[PDB]
Design a protein around this ligand. Structure first.
Ligand SMILES: [Mg+2]
Ligand SMILES: [Mg+2]
Ligand SMILES: [Mg+2]
Ligand SMILES: [Mg+2]
Ligand SMILES: [Mg+2]
Ligand SMILES: [Mg+2]
Ligand SMILES: [Mg+2]
Ligand SMILES: [Mg+2]
Ligand SMILES: [Mg+2]
Ligand SMILES: [Mg+2]
Ligand SMILES: [Mg+2]
Ligand SMILES: [Mg+2]
Ligand SMILES: [Mg+2]
Ligand SMILES: [Mg+2]
Ligand SMILES: [Mg+2]
Ligand SMILES: [Mg+2]
Lengths: 171, 171, 171, 171, 171, 171
């Protein structure tokens, strides 16, 4: 590529793997979003919350795809694995699953950053720091907040907990 | 499901298959969109066009997921298969692939409609007719228009064709 | 902490020490601010300048406290040491003391950054670079400018110097 | 000091002690504020409430520093002691600690007022009455209200109490 | 310098060399801009495009000069070498020359970043990442896009190519 | 050149030399501008003043480059020589150097005008008179004003002079 400069094939590959992971995260959140609009779940603000997260993950994927193009890498898409469950069990369980997902995505981003650093790719390093690392920290913190509140409120067994959390925190 | 009424498990299954197909179509268009943003393709309005199509396909998927929940079905997500190519070769080839994709999706929707009709599910039948069947016809027609113009203009070999089509038709 | 990820206890501790240092800097500037509104100093724009700096330092402290929470660290507050003087002697001396303070805070931030780097904490590294390192450089530069002008103008002995600097530069 | 008039050195000293106490109160509230932003507390309106209180205490400190300068006293800053805890245990416990803090600050202000009265300093007496004594009464009353509601609602053990109090009263 | 802190003389020198390189890039683009407004070239949007790039390069130079001052370095200006050609041959050739120039400038910036990293200057590292590295990637990508389109369109020999590219892409 | 008319190659050459001189003047002013932003100079309105002059010189250069193209001449760029100093010593010395620079540029413009007149090029003559000769007179007068005031005020040794001149005249 006539634009490619200081862009290691390993970084290119890792970016492609990260693209897939971001798409996967979008899919997970999409699944959660539509779990919460089931008639036997019907937590519309959980649904909206995860829908929003899903679209944010798509933007995360797209920024990496743009990065790949900008750097002269070649996007290599892979299957977006279905989420691990279709029944996310409860608002709390979904929040906990999302928290685990974000920490896993964060770990992947940190490994990607270590790779960028190993390859002396400050542009990639900065790209991750600018657009992903703090977004991950904020997302993990937010999910942590949500998990704690839901746990403290007695979710999922306390019938009012997820309902009230849905209307107040996620409203 | 206490909302489920006149909703055949075959229709539920076919809706889940259609959800996956719509997600797949979104993915195909996403791949195309970022193919045209490659430095060695750089047809930004092809890119935008397919990006828009990608997001519309996501809405197609979501409406079916909404339908599933509305009818008391249970969304069953599957892997979103990667698109058949990462290199979409040219604006014309991408348009032709999109055309083939839309006709395939249309065939799936028509089969879904035949199933809805077979199962006496007028709500599902109307749902497809209202939101999918004409949208598919419109999309197939548009892609056909685009394919014809690109062919007529000499794409992909005529160097000005895809460039001018990008700026004029997709602008 | 269920949010804690790639966050070394040393970094957590260093952030707590930095929080204290930022609070200390706020206090120093608060002291300076109210030194300059003494009836026998009465340099109201020196006062406002240092008051503004004081509040900025509080925001610096708060961002680190937020960082601590975001990363799952536990804020550990310590006494905010009183400033080294209550009588800041002159506009020039206060500016020079502030300059020294900022360079000391900068050194602490650079050590914190080296620690983040040593611990492979790019989020923390980026956090410091994004919110502190350049703010420090700009603050040190500004104080350097102020010190130079005050020195060149003949502060503190030239009776018009701090007065005119107060009204023009700090106005 | 050419402005000093009817300003007893005891009052000057007591004002300096009160400045420190107000700064200390600010610090206590700052600690509480960021306690409630912990991922395992995550009561954002408790956090905001105490943050607001913290900044109000800083204004309390500053008005006394202003008073010191206005009267020709000399501000003598002391270490701002760290708050007694970094872990404020619960919204209720923090409210109760804040209540105790405000009554302690109020006692100090009342002693300061008695001193002002003993020294025939009506300006200082009026200053305290105008800006501190009723503010303290209001603050103590508000915290008492909050404590009662939290207790009545079952805080901290009733999982919904602090959550609902956070969203409704502190919202 | 009383502001100088953690600023290695090598970094200072490298910044001065980078200032010159940025000024040089501005000059190259200025030359290109006025090449395209020759009566026998007369591609006014190529001209405007390179004029814009020229002024952007001046801002790149100025930010480095400001950085030098901010850090306490001493700007040391050198001759701005004339561009390698006055006759830039064609829109395509100018775009290709600009692409090569940007990659060369990028290489210099990456070397500067490696130096900053070697010298443990995170402020300088962040400065380059924040203001230069991604700007370079975007500029190289854009020029790559432009080069590809011009090549594909048949520039410079296809008489309509640069004309149409001028009006559509650079308009 | 099919536009070239009554345009002597000597005039073309002299215009190219004048372009370089205007670029050089821009560079001198750029150097001065960033000299006054040094932490040990810190005369921000001197800095702004010379920065403005620098950009005006670039416009002077560009109008001549425009003229060259308009007349069918061929721009021949040369190295832009670095300014004679990086340390401009004082606001007064910089003003005096700028004054000398402008008179030198003016002399070059007057020689260019004499050449235009010798070659019977009234368009070039008018071009210089319309856009350069009075601008030079105005600039030389302004710098003379500034030099006189700075001298009269006691610059550079009177510590308040350049400071006050910076804030009042250059503000
Ligand atoms: Mg993501
Ligand atoms: Mg496969
Ligand atoms: Mg599987
Ligand atoms: Mg569709
Ligand atoms: Mg029908
Ligand atoms: Mg600070
Ligand atoms: Mg202690
Ligand atoms: Mg002590
Ligand atoms: Mg780094
Ligand atoms: Mg108070
Ligand atoms: Mg009374
Ligand atoms: Mg540049
Ligand atoms: Mg030389
Ligand atoms: Mg040469
Ligand atoms: Mg000029
Ligand atoms: Mg005449």
């Amino acid at each position: 590529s006539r634009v490619r400069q200081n862009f290691h094939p390993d970084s290119e590959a890792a970016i492609n793997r990260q693209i897939n992971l971001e798409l996967y995260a979008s899919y997970v959140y999409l699944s959660m979003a539509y779990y919460f609009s089931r008639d036997d779940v019907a937590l519309n603000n959980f649904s909206r919350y995860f829908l929003h997260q899903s679209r944010e993950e798509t933007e995360h994927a797209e920024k990496l795809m743009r990065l790949q193009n900008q750097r002269g890498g070649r996007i290599r898409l892979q299957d977006i694995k279905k989420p691990e469950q279709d029944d996310w069990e409860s608002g709390l369980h979904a929040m906990e699953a999302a928290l685990l997902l974000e920490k896993n995505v964060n770990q992947s981003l940190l490994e990607l950053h270590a790779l960028a650093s190993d390859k002396g790719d400050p542009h990639l390093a900065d790209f991750l720091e600018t657009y992903y690392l703090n977004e991950q920290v904020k997302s993990i913190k937010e999910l942590g907040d949500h998990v704690h509140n839901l746990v403290k409120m007695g979710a999922p067994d306390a019938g009012l907990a997820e309902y009230l959390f849905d209307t107040h925190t996620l409203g």
